[PDB]
Amino acid sequence: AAKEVKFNSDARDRMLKGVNILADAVKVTLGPKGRNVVIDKSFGAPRITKDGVSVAKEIELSDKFENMGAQMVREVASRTNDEAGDGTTTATVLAQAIVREGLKAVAAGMNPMDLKRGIDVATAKVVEAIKSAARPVNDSSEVAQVGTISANGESFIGQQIAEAMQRVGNEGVITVEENKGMETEVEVVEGMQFDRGYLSPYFVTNADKMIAELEDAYILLHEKKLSSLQPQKPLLIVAEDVEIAAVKAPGFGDRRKAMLQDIAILTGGIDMLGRAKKVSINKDNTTIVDGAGEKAEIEARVSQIRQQIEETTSDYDREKLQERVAKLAGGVAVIRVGGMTEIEVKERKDRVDDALNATRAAVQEGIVVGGGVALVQGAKVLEGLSGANSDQDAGIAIIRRALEAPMRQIAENAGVDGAVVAGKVRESSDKAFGFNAQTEEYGDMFKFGVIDPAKVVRTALEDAASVAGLLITTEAMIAEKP
Amino acid sequence: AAKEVKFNSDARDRMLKGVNILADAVKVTLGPKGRNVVIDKSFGAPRITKDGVSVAKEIELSDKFENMGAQMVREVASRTNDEAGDGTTTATVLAQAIVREGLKAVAAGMNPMDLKRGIDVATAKVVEAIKSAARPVNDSSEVAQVGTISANGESFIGQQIAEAMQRVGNEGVITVEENKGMETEVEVVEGMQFDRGYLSPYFVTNADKMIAELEDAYILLHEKKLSSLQPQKPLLIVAEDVEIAAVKAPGFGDRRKAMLQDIAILTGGIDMLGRAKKVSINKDNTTIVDGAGEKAEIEARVSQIRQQIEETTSDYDREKLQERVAKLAGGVAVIRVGGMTEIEVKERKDRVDDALNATRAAVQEGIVVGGGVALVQGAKVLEGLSGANSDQDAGIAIIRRALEAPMRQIAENAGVDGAVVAGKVRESSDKAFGFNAQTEEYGDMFKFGVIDPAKVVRTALEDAASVAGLLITTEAMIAEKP
Amino acid sequence: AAKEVKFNSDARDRMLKGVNILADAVKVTLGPKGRNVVIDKSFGAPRITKDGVSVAKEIELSDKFENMGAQMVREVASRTNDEAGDGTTTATVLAQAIVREGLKAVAAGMNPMDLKRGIDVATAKVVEAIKSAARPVNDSSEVAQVGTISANGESFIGQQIAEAMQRVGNEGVITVEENKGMETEVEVVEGMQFDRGYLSPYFVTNADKMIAELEDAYILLHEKKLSSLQPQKPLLIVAEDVEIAAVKAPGFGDRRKAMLQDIAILTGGIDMLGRAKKVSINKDNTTIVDGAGEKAEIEARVSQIRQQIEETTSDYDREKLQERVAKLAGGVAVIRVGGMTEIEVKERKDRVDDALNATRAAVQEGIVVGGGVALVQGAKVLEGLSGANSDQDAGIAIIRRALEAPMRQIAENAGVDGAVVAGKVRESSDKAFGFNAQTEEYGDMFKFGVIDPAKVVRTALEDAASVAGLLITTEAMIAEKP
Amino acid sequence: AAKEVKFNSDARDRMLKGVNILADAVKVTLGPKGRNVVIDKSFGAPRITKDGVSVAKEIELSDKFENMGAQMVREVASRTNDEAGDGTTTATVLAQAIVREGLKAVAAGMNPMDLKRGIDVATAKVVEAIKSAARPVNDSSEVAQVGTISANGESFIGQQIAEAMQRVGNEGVITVEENKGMETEVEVVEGMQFDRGYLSPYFVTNADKMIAELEDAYILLHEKKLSSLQPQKPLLIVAEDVEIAAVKAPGFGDRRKAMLQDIAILTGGIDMLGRAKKVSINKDNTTIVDGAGEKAEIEARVSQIRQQIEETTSDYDREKLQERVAKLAGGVAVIRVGGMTEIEVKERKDRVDDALNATRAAVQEGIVVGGGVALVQGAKVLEGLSGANSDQDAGIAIIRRALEAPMRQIAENAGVDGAVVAGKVRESSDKAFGFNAQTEEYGDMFKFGVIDPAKVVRTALEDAASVAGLLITTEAMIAEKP
């Protein structure tokens, strides 16, 4: 219906308003000295939080335009949570800085498209200078050190994860779960994990995250779809689509029936159906732990695939078959958390699940100094960089400064003058020298124990500059009329 | 939907508004010279009260933000009522003082995180200096003196409680109940008392407190749950959970079935079900008085557990079994209040139940001078204490002064100049010297009969400083739009 | 929901507003020269009244706070109608005076708690000096003179009541009832009268007062309750409680079944049920006139109880049995009013019922000068009285003056200057000297025929000072938001 | 719910407003030169009237208070229509005068109670001086002259009524009814007429007045009531009450069954039920014309009662039996009006019914000069009268002047200066000298034909002063809030 079209600056000043609100509410909760954010709960007492991710979700401005600015940034920076980490809050604090400066420039006449270019270049140069400075994590002594730190010092969980990893490879398929008594173990059941999620969010039993947990469900599957539905154990349907668990079959093309088969054995597909002790479903990933099939039927498929790839001269499907075989000849580790009471097991399961997510991401691209120093350090690379024109150059300097945002903030929240903490780290020489807001001393961020998966310090920066560019190059907005 | 985000001071000044209203309405009802608070009743004449706990519940401000300030303080200070005492009103009067000063400081630039630190330190030092000054209560001459005082002088109830206690230990399981004629007795039936409450508040027969009273109910129990419900004596179900009485089974792990069994005999679990004359249920505690089992079946379990622990070399489960055995080899005392008419028995049952709650808490951590002097005395400890910086020091002084709040108030309400009553007690030498607002004379608070369970004068102070810290370190608030 | 909290004076000035409206509307209808109060009737012509009790009920102010002030005073002063008399209007006129002065003082700084004390003392001193000055009423010449005066001169009703009283003792159980022709008689049927009322007001057939009249009902009774209801003559159930007439069984403890039995015979408990010609029920008293049992079965119980108490060595239950026996060996007098037409019998029944209530209360504690002089006279006692301090002294003087309220009013309404009428009675010497507004002459209030049951001139004064103290010591009010 | 309480003058000025509106609208329609009052009809053209009684009913002011003033006066003055006459309009015009002056005085300080006294005295003196000046009407030459005048000169109706009266006594039971052809007759059927009306107004077939006309109904009657209703000729039930015609049985006490019997024969109580050609019911009077019983059964009862009273030595029930016998040995005359068309019979029936009502009231207390002169003449008596004080004297003078209201009005409406018409009649000597507004000449009001039943000129004056006293002594009003 009726629409309100805002053009030029009038549309930009409003986006900037919605972004600043979103960034100013989330950024107060950054670092070891974060401040709380009280959130009105429609029933009872208010929710007091420091988790910058729960704040971002609560933000919904009334003014259609201001809200669009917030909704966007908030959406992208939320994808930075694909690896679940402080990326969301950093993506946000970063976006706010770049956008703030970009529009300032745009206003002064600089060409937005160019700024967007100089912004894209400078970003790539840093997204690189970061990787080329991240210490790797492969050894079990490291994977156990990154597992502990990510658990605030729980040397017990650092080893627990290292174990599971050293049982199914640094890039396996772990699944932390609660147990009974005070006994923690790392079993390795025979299960699988597709690369697809659910069909509808309403199909989720969201307890903490959008993940559907189904104990002893009914694993069925056909090469058709779920058109007509006319035709004490949960169910799980895996097909093309729908015109209880509902997930799309794994694989594609000639690998369609094959994939359905590989898993068919894993579950054993009521007498002619597959079974599984547990089956978890997510957005774009579903795991089936403890199937039902028999090692024999499972050893056959793995044998077929082996001999299959043993004949394949195809340099392409060589991996498409060698990869589907690992989903069988690999297994599914599963840390079993246990304590005294439910107030313990359910508690440690959150710490382990939280620390096992930081490590799994630490091993992918390595680890790098935390405290928002990685960004300031990598920014050193933009020293002599130059673009095709003054405008393009501006975009580069914007990023050169935006990278100091998450650090000065973290410093300000602690009471220290971020302008100083930044200047010291800038004039630094040791690529691992920063400021530790926890104790308030400068030094080797690594020796300090202040580290961050390089995969999040990288995704945050890309995602930020991703939107900062869109916003900066937006000329008109169309919102519905009240 | 739409949200109103308040930042910095703008969000603090509002919280302070909601807290001051809540604290100013409750604190008028403090001490022996408390003033009344008239409460509009939606039907009939207004409710006139002096009970600062009934006032706190009635407070619900209209302004979303102001209400959050009140809702918080009011929530925490309500947990101080876990031991049921003047803690709620004191936690409140204290919180209001600390917060008032904290924000004042914050405003002047002092770092909130530091103030929060100096506040936390100073508090621990006092929460300690209090315990290390509380006269213990173990002897039956004491437990009967604290039982009488807590009953305004009813030497009859002081002994009544002392008896029940000297029959099931200072830390047993008493249950005051109404009788028939003018006869008071302390029987010791065979019952139990888990450490779990109900599942839903709507399941409570709230007559005065959130406690479910079930006479001759049906005690059933299985190792499953209450998923499908499809499959003249009340009922009580004890299982894992529900997907009439409903409570979660006691114990955990290998102690699950064991616990269910220990109680199974106590009730005798229709021919294959357990029974009990009375079963009370609370928030996190359920009591089963007068079961149904036979001394024989009960003497067997106690015998098994004995021989069981007699073999256990485990230095851990040694208590996990020795404790579950006491739930059987202990019994459940039960004071039987009796008078002339229902206007008597129902009256004395409230005095006994009220005095038996003050004692049961007096024996846990001892007793200490009442009248809000314990706090002012312990505050003496902060004399030379110092923090890492001026800011941290400020937090310490805030507490040094906030502790004089409940006393000056109690004095002002009586007509005496709290500034003076405080100065005298400050320059005091005898750790038991204070001011008795009842008679208006200074002296030995103990000889005076003005005492307070050290467990409440301690919980109040911790809880207050608990929120005073959260509020002081809150940077942004998010409330829904009208 | 949302609440408006008023503190200090702001809350007091509002209460005072609601009280003054209530007292100013009711007090215009005081004495022999009362003025009318027109009351809007939702249908037809307005109700013209002089009865200060019907006015008090109509008062409901719109402002939540002002209304609380009125609702309170109006509630207490309504209990003064427990003996049904001009107490309500006097309690009100008195409360208004004390409160008016109290808050005035409070405002000047005087301590409310103290004023409340000096008010309580002075009151007791007068509530006493009154009793110790009331001429007794025992003789039938007196009980018939107080019975006539209370009937505006109906010497016929003065004797009618005296008779019934001289047939069942000055403290018996009379029950005035309508007859047929112009014949008035005082029969003495065999009935009882418990000390309990009904369970629900909606169970009342309120014709004039909250009294349930049941002719030939079904008297049943068991030692259980009215839990499940599943299992041309009205019914009446008497049990513990309910989970047509419904009343709780009489007695307690071992006297439970006994009481139910004593009455069981009185009614004869369909073939195995008790019956009764008439059964009236009130708030806390139920009467059963003309039962059904036979003198024999009734003479047996009385015989058992006699021999029972004849053996009882108990100096306690000696009365608990001797009293329950009188409920049988006493009877129930019953004045039978009769006239020409229903416009007569129904008219005289109101005069007799109204005069028989003033006498029954006159014999309990005696009679004392009316016209509001008793109060002014007793106030003489406070001549030298003194409290612990100036504040306490103030409370005493407030009462010393408030007692002149109902008299000056009664005088003003008549056209006489209450300041003068008060001064004369003050300088008086004869404790029975006052002012008779009916004729406008001073003298012996007793010889004048201006008397008041000392029980109402006493209850009014206690009830007034009861609330005047609560209001004066109220610091905060909580009302719901519009 | 919420109430608005108006006190003192503020409440009086408003009542006076509602009265003045009511009196000013009605009084324009007074006398032979009355002006019309147009009344908006919710459908069609407006109703043009001169009947001051139809105007009074239409008055309903919006302001709660103003309306109370009108509703009251309007109610009382309506009872003056008990004898159906110009009393209503006169009661009103009078009330307005007294009240207007009373409040004026009250305002000046005069005591209302006294004024009310001086008003009551003076009124009695006149209500008397009137009777002691009314020519009687007993002869059929007179009863026929008052019957004609009351019919604007219809000498035909003057005799028609005289006849019916001379057939059933000057105080019999006449019932004018419509006939068929142009034939008028005065039959004397055998019927009765109790002294009771109906139970509910909704039970009325109101055609012109609240009177239920039932032709050939079913006359039933029992000594019980109409509790349970479960158990081409109309019906009529006569019992105690109800828990088609519904009326309460006649008589009382031992005369209950007797009365029901006396009428039982009159109707003959389907085979065992009483019948009657016609039965009319009113507010407090019911007539049964042309019963069904047989002269024999009727002559028996009359015979029994005769012999009954012939033995009764009772000087009391001598009339209670002699009166009930006349209800049988009397009969019920009934003028039968007839004309040419329904536009005639229905027209003359209104004139006869209207004139037969003025006569029936003229014979009760006589007749006196009309034109509002009776009042002015009787006022002469207050010449030397005096009360206990100046205030009481004022009340007397108020009445001395209010009595000239209906006359000056009647004069003003005609165009003559009421101040003059009053002065002449005042200085008059002949107690029958006045002013005839019809012709505009002074003289002998009697010879003029200007007369008024002394019963209405008396009731109007009593009723007026009745309320004028209530209003004048009203101190507070309570109306509901909008």
Swiss-Prot record, chains A, B, C, D:
Chief site of localization: cytoplasm
Keyword Cytoplasm set for record: yes
One cellular component term from this protein's GO annotations in UniProt: cytoplasm
Enzyme Commission number(s) from the entry: 5.6.1.7
Compartments (UniProt record): Cytoplasm
GO terms assigned for molecular function: ATP binding; ATP-dependent protein folding chaperone; isomerase activity; unfolded protein binding
Residues engaged in binding ATP: T29, L30, G31, P32, K50, D86, G87, T88, T89, T90, G371, D452
Protein's UniProt keywords contain Chaperone: yes
Assigned keywords, A-Z: ATP-binding, Chaperone, Cytoplasm, Isomerase, Nucleotide-binding
SUPFAM superfamilies in alphabetical order: GroEL apical domain-like (SSF52029), GroEL equatorial domain-like (SSF48592), GroEL-intermediate domain like (SSF54849)
Signal sequence, start to end: none
EC main group: isomerase
Stretches that traverse the bilayer: none
GO biological process: protein refolding
PROSITE patterns hit by this protein: CHAPERONINS_CPN60
Pfam families named among the record's database cross-references: Cpn60_TCP1
Lineage: superkingdom: Bacteria
Assigned protein family: Belongs to the chaperonin (HSP60) family.
Assembly description: Forms a cylinder of 14 subunits composed of two heptameric rings stacked back-to-back. Interacts with the co-chaperonin GroES.
Function: Together with its co-chaperonin GroES, plays an essential role in assisting protein folding. The GroEL-GroES system forms a nano-cage that allows encapsulation of the non-native substrate proteins and provides a physical environment optimized to promote and accelerate protein folding.
Name the UniProt record assigns to this protein: Chaperonin GroEL
Source organism: Paracoccus denitrificans
Chain's gene name: groEL
